[PDB]
Design a protein around this ligand. Structure first.
Ligand SMILES: [Zn+2]
Ligand SMILES: [Zn+2]
Lengths: 62, 115, 905
RNA sequence: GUGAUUUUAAUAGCUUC
RNA sequence: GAAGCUAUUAAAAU
C-alpha cells in the first residue's frame, strides 16, 4: 500500500542491524530504535520515506 | 537426590562467600551499638560499604552531584577512582564538560572509595 | 443602618454582598442528618446576610460578616452556649442584637468558603466545573489565575506540579485540625454535648453554629467527631497536611529533624501524633497491628499508620536484621520488619546459636535479601526517584528489546490476494517495538505515580462488608502440599534461585514434609523476598515497554498452598459476577451477556478503564483485597496465623526489594503482576471501586427530591450505617447488596468490567455513573478518568462496545440469534505477519499457529463489511496451501471453525 | 534474562464403551 | 468410533 511496504522494510532493516550487532554502540542503537519506532508509528507516507532513507544510511555507512 | 545434593552445595557456597566479603569491623561497631542489637537493613550499606557507585543521566546532574575529584554524600567523603560510560569504556575526568557532553555515551557510572 | 449595626465596636468598612438586609442565597455543601433527609451534598442556604470587608485601599479582602435570622428560642439558646464557650480561642466572634425586634446573630470575620466546601470540591471533582476549587486556590495563594490556562492542569499524570499546588494548603488544614482539638477540649471542659460538622468551620479554623448543642454538667461534655474526621481523612494526605511535623519544633522556617539512623520503633511518636491530632477519636488505635483484634481493626489501625508514616525518615522501614552465629561463624539475617502500614513485627522463632542448616533454612537464608544488601556496594542512582539500596554487581546492566521477525511469505500471499491497498479499512497497526537500554529503568520509574493515600475509614469499612457478599458462593481454606497443582514447572524461580535451576528443581528437591514445614514456618515469621523486573517481548499497538515481576519461589509455594482452593473455586463457578474461568466458545459469550443483562428495567450498558492501574493502586485497597481473600480461613487458621500470613504477603509483594539491572531498589507499593492472586485481587479492587462509586452517588443526591420513599429510606439508613453505627448491620448489608444486584449488574474480569444499569435511576442520581466513577478514582486512586476511553451503549441488540479486546455482533445461528466475539482485524493480521522467533517464519511446520488464528477470526465472516470476511477467507487459503505443498481437510473446511462457536450438543 | 492465572486447538500415549 | 487421562508444541485474553 506504499505504506505497509515501508513499515515492513523498516522492520527488516532493524533486524539486519541487530544481527550485524550495532547494539555495541549505544548511541547507534538508540538512534536506530527511535527511527524504526517513528516509521512504525507514522501515519503519512511522506516523512516515512525520509526516515527510512535516514535509517538505511546507517547500514550504508559500514 | 543428586539434584538436592548439588543445589545444597550451591546455596551454602554463596552464603559463606558473602559472609567472608562482610565488612566485619564496621558492621560490628554499629550492630552492638543498637539498643537491642537490631538495626534497619537500608542503613547497613549506607554506613558500612567501602565503595560507592553513582549513575548520572546528563551533565547538569553531574555538575550538581559529582563536581570535582572528591565529593560528599551520606555524611562522608568519597575519592573518585574510575568513571565509565554506558559502553563499559574508561572515561577521563577531563572529557566531562559542556562542550564535549553530546559526544559522550550517557549515562556514566562513577566508582568511588570511602575516605 | 443594618450596615452600622453589623459594624459594631470593631468598626470596619463593610461591602453589602447582596441587597442589603435581604439574605444572600448561595449554593454550598452541607453534612446533613435529620429525621427527613441525610447525606453530604450541595443545598441552598437562604438565611444569611453577607457583608464583605474593605480596608484603607477600599479593595475587598477574604473577610465576611454573616448575619442570620432565626427564632427567639434559638436566640436565647445560642446566647447561652456562646457565653459558655466564649473563652475558647478557636471560636469566631459573635454579636447578638435585634433591630427591625427580629433577632439577628452576627458572625464576624468569616471566610467565603468552608472546610465542607473544600472537601466537597476535592471529593466530587468535575473538570470544566471546578469553579469553587479554582477560586479557593486563587484566594489562598496556592497558584495564579494563569495556571489554569495550561491544559490538563488538573491531572496527576500529565501535570505533576498539581501536587505542589495542592500541598500549598497543608498548613491551613493543619491549623484547622489544631483548632478543632482545642474546640473539643473547650466543649469537654464546659460540659456541652454536640456533633461537629465540617460546614460549621470556616477555612481559618473557627466554629460558629451552636443551635443543636446541649448543655450538661461541667467536666463531662461529649463532642461527636466521627463524620467530621472520616470525611476529612482523604484530604490530609492529598494536601500533605503533616509536613510541619518533620521540622524542628513544628514550624516550617526551621531545619529538618535529624533522627538517629539506628532508630526504627517510633511507637511513642505515633501515639503522640494521634493524641495531638485525633484526641477525641473514640476508637482504640494500635500503632503495631500485631495487637489488633480482627481484620476490621487492622484496616482501621493501618489507615492511621499510612498518615503517620510520612513524618518519619524513609530509611527506618523494611527488614530488621540481627547477627546470629552458625557454628561460631557470624551470620546476619532478617528478624523482623517495620511496615509503613502494619508497624513493627518481630519473628517468633529466632535462634541466635544454631548449627547444621538444613535445606529449608538454607532456602530461607538464600531468599533473604539482607546478606545480598550487606554484601553489595552503596549505590546512588540519579536516573530515578525511587529509593536505592545497593549494587549487587560491580557494574550496571542494560537490557534491550529486539525487533520482530517478518513473515514475508504470508505478507506476499496477502498482497497477492488483494490486501493492503490504499484507502482500505484494514491496515497493520500492531508491531513489535524495539527498546533501548534505558527502557527497564524508565518503566520502573513509573512507580512514582504511587502516593500514600489515607481513605475514609467509615466508608471503607462499610464497602468491604458489601464487597464480601460477592464472594459468598465459594469454598476456601488451606490445603496440604500434595493437593497443590502447578501448571508450568519449567518457569523461572526468581532471584537468586534462577542461578541453579527452574521451579521444577525446587519442587523436586523439596518433599511434601519440607513444604508443609515451610508453610507452617510462614505462619509465625516474616520472610522478605526479592522480585525481579523483566521485559516482555510481545506485540502491541503502542511503543511503550512491558515489564513484569518475577516473584520468588519461596513466596510462590506458600501463596499457592494458601490460596489455590479459593482461586480454583472462583475459576470453576459459572454464572457469578466474576467471570474468570469462563470460555467464550460454545455459546459462552452469549451466556455471559444474557447473565449480565439479567432483568434490569431500563437497560443501558457502560464500560471504563483504569489509568495506570498496577502502578497507582493504593496500599490500603491492596490490603483490603488481601483481607477479603483471606476471610475464608475462619476454620483452619487463628488470628495470629492470619495476621502473619498478611504480613508475609505485604512484605513479599506490596513493598519489597526489586532487582532491576543488578541493583536493589525499594518498591513504593501498588501491585506486583506475577503474584499468585493478581487477577483475583484486581477483581476485588474493581468491585470495591464500583461499590464506593455507587455509595457516593446515592449519598450525593438531595433527599428532598427522590420521589421513591423506599430509596429515600435506603439513603437515610446508608448514612446511618456509615457514620452512626460501629457494628456491622447484616440486614442492611443484604438489602444494599440486593439493591445493587437488581439495579447495577456487573461482569467483572480483573480490571475490565461491563455494567448493565437502570438509566432512570442513573439520570436521577440513584446509581453510579461515569462522572461518579471519575470523582471516585480522582480522590482515591490519584488518577484522572478521561471520558474518551469510557463508552456507553443505549441499545443492547449491539452488545458491549468492547470487553477483553473483543467486539460483539448479533447474528443468526441455526434458528436463533446469538452474540459472537469478533476481534480486531489488524491484530489478527499482525499476529501472522510478524513473529518473535526465526523458526516460526516457516509455516509448513507451524500450521497450528494459523489454525488457532483462524479460530480467533471465524466470526468476522458475519460482519456487514466485506474486508473482514476477506481476512478470515485469507487465513483459510494459506492453511490449505501449506497442508498441500507439505504432503487434514478439516482445517480448510469452514465447518471445523463454525462448530467452535455453536453450543456443544 | 523471560511472571501470575484462564481458555482453546494440534500431535503422541494410557484407561475405558 | 465413543468418553476420560497424560505428556509435547502452539494461539488468544487480563
Ligand atoms: Zn487495631
Ligand atoms: Zn488457613
Amino acid at each position: 500500500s506504499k505504506m505497509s511496504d515501508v513499515k515492513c522494510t523498516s522492520v527488516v532493516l532493524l533486524s539486519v542491524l541487530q544481527q550485524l550487532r550495532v547494539e555495541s554502540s549505544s548511541k547507534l542503537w538508540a538512534q536506530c530504535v527511535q527511527l524504526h519506532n517513528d516509521i512504525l508509528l507514522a501515519k503519512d507516507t511522506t516523512e516515512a520515506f525520509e526516515k527510512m532513507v535516514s535509517l538505511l544510511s546507517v547500514l550504508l555507512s559500514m | 537426590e543428586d539434584k538436592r545434593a548439588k543445589v545444597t552445595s550451591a546455596m551454602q557456597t554463596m552464603l559463606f562467600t558473602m559472609l567472608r566479603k562482610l565488612d566485619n569491623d564496621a558492621l560490628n561497631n554499629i550492630i552492638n551499638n543498637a539498643r537491642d542489637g537490631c538495626v534497619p537493613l537500608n542503613i547497613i550499606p549506607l554506613t558500612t560499604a567501602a565503595k560507592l557507585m553513582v549513575v548520572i543521566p546528563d551533565y547538569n546532574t553531574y555538575k550538581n552531584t559529582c563536581d570535582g575529584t572528591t565529593f560528599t554524600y551520606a555524611s562522608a567523603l568519597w575519592e573518585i577512582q574510575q568513571v565509565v560510560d554506558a559502553d563499559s569504556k574508561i572515561v577521563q575526568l577531563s572529557e566531562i564538560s559542556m562542550d564535549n557532553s553530546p559526544n559522550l555515551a550517557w549515562p556514566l557510572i562513577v566508582t568511588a572509595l570511602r575516605a | 443602618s443594618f450596615l452600622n449595626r453589623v459594624c459594631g465596636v470593631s468598626a470596619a468598612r463593610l461591602t453589602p454582598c447582596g441587597t442589603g438586609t435581604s439574605t444572600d442565597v448561595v449554593y454550598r455543601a452541607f453534612d446533613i442528618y435529620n429525621d427527613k433527609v441525610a447525606g453530604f451534598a450541595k443545598f441552598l442556604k437562604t438565611n444569611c446576610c453577607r457583608f464583605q470587608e474593605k480596608d484603607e485601599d477600599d479593595n475587598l479582602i477574604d473577610s465576611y460578616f454573616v448575619v442570620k435570622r432565626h427564632t427567639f428560642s434559638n436566640y436565647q439558646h445560642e446566647e447561652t452556649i456562646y457565653n459558655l464557650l466564649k473563652d475558647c480561642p478557636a471560636v469566631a466572634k459573635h454579636d447578638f442584637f435585634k433591630f427591625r425586634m427580629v433577632p439577628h446573630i452576627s458572625r464576624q470575620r468569616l471566610t467565603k468558603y468552608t472546610m465542607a466546601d473544600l472537601v466537597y470540591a476535592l471529593r466530587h471533582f468535575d473538570e470544566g466545573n471546578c469553579d469553587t476549587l479554582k477560586e479557593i486556590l486563587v484566594t489562598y495563594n496556592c497558584c495564579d489565575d494563569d495556571y489554569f490556562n495550561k491544559k490538563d492542569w488538573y491531572d496527576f499524570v500529565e501535570n505533576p506540579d498539581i501536587l505542589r499546588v495542592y500541598a500549598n494548603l497543608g498548613e491551613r488544614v493543619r491549623q484547622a485540625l489544631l483548632k478543632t482539638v482545642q474546640f473539643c477540649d473547650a466543649m469537654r471542659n464546659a460540659g456541652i454535648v454536640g456533633v461537629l460538622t465540617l460546614d460549621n468551620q470556616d477555612l481559618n479554623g473557627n466554629w460558629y453554629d451552636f443551635g443543636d448543642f446541649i448543655q450538661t454538667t461541667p467536666g463531662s461534655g461529649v463532642p461527636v467527631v466521627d463524620s467530621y474526621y472520616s470525611l476529612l481523612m482523604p484530604i490530609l494526605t492529598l494536601t500533605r497536611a503533616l509536613t510541619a511535623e518533620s521540622h524542628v519544633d513544628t514550624d516550617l522556617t526551621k531545619p529538618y529533624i535529624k533522627w538517629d539512623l539506628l532508630k526504627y520503633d517510633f511507637t511513642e511518636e505515633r501515639l503522640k501524633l494521634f493524641d495531638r491530632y485525633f484526641k477525641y477519636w473514640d476508637q482504640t488505635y494500635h500503632p503495631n497491628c500485631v495487637n489488633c483484634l480482627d481484620d476490621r481493626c487492622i484496616l482501621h489501625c493501618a489507615n492511621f499508620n499510612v498518615l503517620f508514616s510520612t513524618v518519619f525518615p524513609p530509611t527506618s522501614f523494611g527488614p530488621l536484621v540481627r547477627k546470629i552465629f552458625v557454628d561460631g561463624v557470624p551470620f546476619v539475617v532478617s528478624t523482623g520488619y517495620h511496615f509503613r502500614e502494619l508497624g513493627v513485627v518481630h519473628n517468633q522463632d529466632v535462634n541466635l546459636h544454631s548449627s547444621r542448616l538444613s535445606f529449608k533454612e538454607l532456602l530461607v537464608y538464600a531468599a533473604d535479601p539482607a546478606m545480598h544488601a550487606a554484601s553489595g556496594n552503596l549505590l546512588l542512582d540519579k536516573r530515578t526517584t525511587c529509593f536505592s539500596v545497593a549494587a549487587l554487581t560491580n557494574n550496571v546492566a542494560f537490557q534491550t528489546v529486539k525487533p520482530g521477525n517478518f513473515n514475508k511469505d504470508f505478507y506476499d500471499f496477502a498482497v497477492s490476494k488483494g490486501f493492503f491497498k490504499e484507502g482500505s479499512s484494514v491496515e497493520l497497526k500492531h508491531f513489535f517495538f524495539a527498546q533501548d537500554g534505558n527502557a527497564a529503568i524508565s518503566d520502573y520509574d513509573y512507580y512514582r505515580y504511587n502516593l500514600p493515600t489515607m481513605c475514609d475509614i467509615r466508608q471503607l469499612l462499610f464497602v468491604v462488608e458489601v464487597v464480601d457478599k460477592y464472594f459468598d458462593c465459594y469454598d476456601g481454606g488451606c490445603i496440604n502440599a500434595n493437593q497443590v497443582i502447578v501448571n508450568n514447572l519449567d518457569k523461572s524461580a526468581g532471584f537468586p534461585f534462577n542461578k541453579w535451576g527452574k521451579a521444577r528443581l525446587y519442587y523436586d528437591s523439596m518433599s511434601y514434609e519440607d513444604q508443609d514445614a515451610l508453610f507452617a514456618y510462614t505462619k509465625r515469621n516474616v520472610i522478605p523476598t526479592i522480585t525481579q523486573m523483566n521485559l516482555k517481548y510481545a506485540i502491541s499497538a503502542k511503543n511503550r515497554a512491558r515489564t513484569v515481576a518475577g516473584v520468588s519461589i519461596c513466596s510462590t509455594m506458600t501463596n499457592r498452598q494458601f490460596h489455590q482452593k479459593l482461586l480454583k473455586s472462583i475459576a470453576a463457578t459459572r454464572g457469578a459476577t466474576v467471570v474468570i474461568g469462563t470460555s467464550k466458545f460454545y455459546g459462552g459469550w452469549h451466556n455471559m451477556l444474557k447473565t449480565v443483562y439479567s432483568d434490569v428495567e431500563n437497560p443501558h450498558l457502560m464500560g471504563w478503564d483504569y489509568p495506570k492501574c498496577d502502578r497507582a493502586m493504593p496500599n490500603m485497597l491492596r490490603i483490603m483485597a488481601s483481607l477479603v481473600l483471606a476471610r475464608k480461613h475462619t476454620t483452619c487458621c487463628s488470628l495470629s496465623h492470619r495476621f502473619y500470613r498478611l504480613a508475609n504477603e505485604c512484605a513479599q509483594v506490596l513493598s519489597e526489594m526489586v532487582m532491576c539491572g543488578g541493583s536493589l531498589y525499594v518498591k513504593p507499593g501498588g501491585t506486583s503482576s506475577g503474584d499468585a492472586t493478581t487477577a483475583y485481587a484486581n477483581s476485588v479492587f474493581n468491585i470495591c471501586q464500583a461499590v464506593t462509586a455507587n455509595v457516593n452517588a446515592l449519598l450525593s443526591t438531595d433527599g428532598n427530591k427522590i420521589a421513591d420513599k423506599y430509596v429515600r429510606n435506603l439513603q437515610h439508613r446508608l448514612y446511618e450505617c456509615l457514620y452512626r453505627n460501629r457494628d456491622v448491620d447484616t440486614d442492611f448489608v443484604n438489602e444494599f447488596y440486593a439493591y445493587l444486584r437488581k439495579h447495577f449488574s456487573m461482569m467483572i474480569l480483573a480490571d475490565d468490567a461491563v455494567v448493565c444499569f437502570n438509566s432512570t435511576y442513573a439520570s436521577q442520581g440513584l446509581v453510579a455513573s461515569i462522572k461518579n466513577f471519575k470523582s471516585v478514582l480522582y480522590y482515591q486512586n490519584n488518577v484522572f478518568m478521561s471520558e474518551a476511553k469510557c463508552w456507553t451503549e443505549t441499545d443492547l441488540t449491539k452488545g458491549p462496545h468492547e470487553f477483553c479486546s473483543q467486539h460483539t455482533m448479533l447474528v443468526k445461528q441455526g434458528d436463533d440469534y446469538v452474540y459472537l466475539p469478533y476481534p480486531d482485524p489488524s491484530r489478527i493480521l499482525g499476529a501472522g505477519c510478524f513473529v518473535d522467533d526465526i523458526v516460526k517464519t516457516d509455516g509448513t511446520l507451524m500450521i497450528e499457529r494459523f489454525v488457532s488464528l483462524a479460530i480467533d477470526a471465524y466470526p468476522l465472516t458475519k460482519h456487514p463489511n466485506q474486508e473482514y470476511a476477506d481476512v478470515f477467507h485469507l487465513y483459510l487459503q494459506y492453511i490449505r496451501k501449506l497442508h498441500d505443498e507439505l504432503t487434514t481437510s478439516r482445517y480448510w473446511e469452514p465447518e471445523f471453525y463454525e462448530a467452535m462457536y455453536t453450543p456443544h450438543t
